[PDB]
Design an enzyme around this catalytic site. Structure first.
Site, PDB file in Angstrom:
ATOM      1  N   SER A 103       0.792  -1.234   0.000  1.00  0.00           N
ATOM      2  CA  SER A 103       0.000   0.000   0.000  1.00  0.00           C
ATOM      3  C   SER A 103       0.818   1.274   0.000  1.00  0.00           C
ATOM      4  O   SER A 103       0.220   2.351  -0.088  1.00  0.00           O
ATOM      5  CB  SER A 103      -0.955   0.057   1.173  1.00  0.00           C
ATOM      6  OG  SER A 103      -2.083  -0.760   0.914  1.00  0.00           O
ATOM      7  N   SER A 132       2.162   3.319   5.134  1.00  0.00           N
ATOM      8  CA  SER A 132       2.449   1.930   5.477  1.00  0.00           C
ATOM      9  C   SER A 132       2.007   0.969   4.378  1.00  0.00           C
ATOM     10  O   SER A 132       1.196   1.300   3.501  1.00  0.00           O
ATOM     11  CB  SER A 132       1.693   1.554   6.751  1.00  0.00           C
ATOM     12  OG  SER A 132       0.313   1.831   6.604  1.00  0.00           O
ATOM     13  N   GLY A 133       2.582  -0.213   4.425  1.00  0.00           N
ATOM     14  CA  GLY A 133       2.115  -1.299   3.595  1.00  0.00           C
ATOM     15  C   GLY A 133       2.263  -2.643   4.272  1.00  0.00           C
ATOM     16  O   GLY A 133       3.129  -2.844   5.138  1.00  0.00           O
TER      17      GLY A 133
END
Ligand SMILES: [Cl-]
Ligand SMILES: [Cl-]
Ligand SMILES: [Cl-]
Ligand SMILES: [Cl-]
Ligand SMILES: [Cl-]
Ligand SMILES: [Cl-]
Ligand SMILES: [Cl-]
Ligand SMILES: [Cl-]
Ligand SMILES: [Cl-]
Lengths: 262, 262
Positions: free
Chosen positions: B44, B207-208
């Protein structure tokens, strides 16, 4: 060619006007040029080119964006926009009103959408047009004195830009069709290039008018079974209160079409 | 520098993970690089870059355009979009939901607005990024097998792109501020780069997360009185069902900040 030069000069004498003509036949790669590199105030003809710029800037879905404006934005000629203050107008409705009816409020909303006159100029520069010189919004843009460079272009340049948007590679196929349809079938064109065109040669145009008896028309003209003809005809007189006569434009158009159909 | 290489390698051993780090301190022109040119699935993190692309494409007024979508577009993680089917969401609301909450429907609407994965790729290519390789929409984009090139980039490339949008000349001052504010103050960032940052150094991140225990974070970090630090930390494991541990990212961040504050 000396035959059409004589005919255009005779029109200038007959009407007491300065005439500028550039036409390009994309089927045959021939041109008709008469004062094609002289500057004229373009008046409302720009609205077709600014709509081209909207189409290049925006996705198809962005054409549905709703724009709200106030009563103070409604100008003395705003036949569509004066009725849509409360509900707003979408970008495509604005482009349609500017091209089909020459609505001046719609034209100002259109200009706002592409960054004002300076943004429109930047878009034309990106297309390779370093001649057209947008300066004002409506209503001042058709009111410049003779000799101003602001709000002027040349017949050749206007025709070249219209050709780029309607036939070139600037716009996708679908966007070309949107632009040409905006320009097609509008009454404001009836007495101008369309009046001089053969009945089966479809004319999609944008007219212009101003003080100094300014009367202009730009168009894409589509004969059956052939590639299109792109035309700009600009005209002006010497004195601010001069009348114009649309027959000057219709007769200049007939000269162009006869020259291309020999 | 061999001091931080040892510390990052120790983290890899301690967590059983592959770690990729690139950070650039724009105050001092120093970098920290660890597997900085290795490819990782970006998950993401891309949502911040795609929002950059929206800002570059669109005028400020275009951010207010309302978008309608259907129940079928609502994915299993769509904490904002699942509640706005009836009324729609504006472009800026979509960008906010994608960045602040990682809403996957909002991310798909965002991608649609810039032309799909192929349009996002084209925008990155125009910025000079020939490494990042967008292929899928959500939810497939974080599910690629190790070794795929689709939906991957490198730590260096992601940091370079984030730097271009947040500090470079791609966006106007006002658009930079919009992007950075979208990225600032979101809970999804709390356990990642922000957890390793000094308390007065403001972290604006994205973030991911993914299978293979993928856990990533990209950020602009703003110390008092100094120019910003740009960071990308990507991480992955070998097996699809691996767990991740956010402390890997927080500890890698502390190493970066210590390295820049000597
Ligand atoms: Cl809208
Ligand atoms: Cl009116
Ligand atoms: Cl209309
Ligand atoms: Cl286009
Ligand atoms: Cl016609
Ligand atoms: Cl949800
Ligand atoms: Cl939100
Ligand atoms: Cl910008
Ligand atoms: Cl913070």
């Amino acid at each position: 060619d000396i035959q059409y030069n004589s005919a255009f000069s005779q029109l200038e004498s007959d009407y007491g006007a300065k005439l500028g003509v550039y036409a390009f036949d994309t089927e045959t790669n021939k041109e008709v040029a008469y004062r094609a590199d002289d500057r004229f105030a373009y008046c409302s003809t720009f609205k077709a080119l600014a709509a081209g710029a909207v189409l290049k800037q925006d996705s198809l879905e962005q054409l549905k964006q709703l724009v709200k404006y106030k009563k103070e934005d409604v100008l003395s000629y705003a036949p569509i926009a004066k009725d849509n203050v409360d509900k707003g107008m979408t970008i495509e409705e604005i482009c349609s009103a500017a091209i089909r009816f020459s609505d001046n409020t719609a034209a100002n909303l259109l200009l706002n959408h592409i960054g004002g006159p300076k943004g429109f100029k930047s878009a034309l520069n990106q297309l390779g047009d370093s001649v057209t010189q947008p300066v004002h919004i409506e209503p001042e843009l058709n009111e410049g004195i003779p000799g101003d460079i602001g709000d002027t272009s040349t017949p050749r340049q206007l025709a070249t830009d219209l050709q780029a948007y309607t036939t070139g590679n600037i716009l996708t196929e679908d966007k070309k069709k949107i632009l040409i349809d905006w320009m097609a079938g509008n009454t404001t064109g009836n007495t101008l290039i369309r009046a001089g065109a053969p009945k089966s040669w479809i004319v999609a145009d944008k007219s212009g008018t101003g003080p100094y008896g300014r009367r202009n028309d730009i168009a894409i003209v589509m004969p059956p079974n052939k590639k299109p003809i792109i035309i700009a005809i600009l005209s002006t007189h010497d004195t601010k209160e001069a009348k114009y006569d649309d027959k000057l434009i219709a007769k200049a158009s007939k000269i162009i079409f006869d020259s291309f159909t020999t």
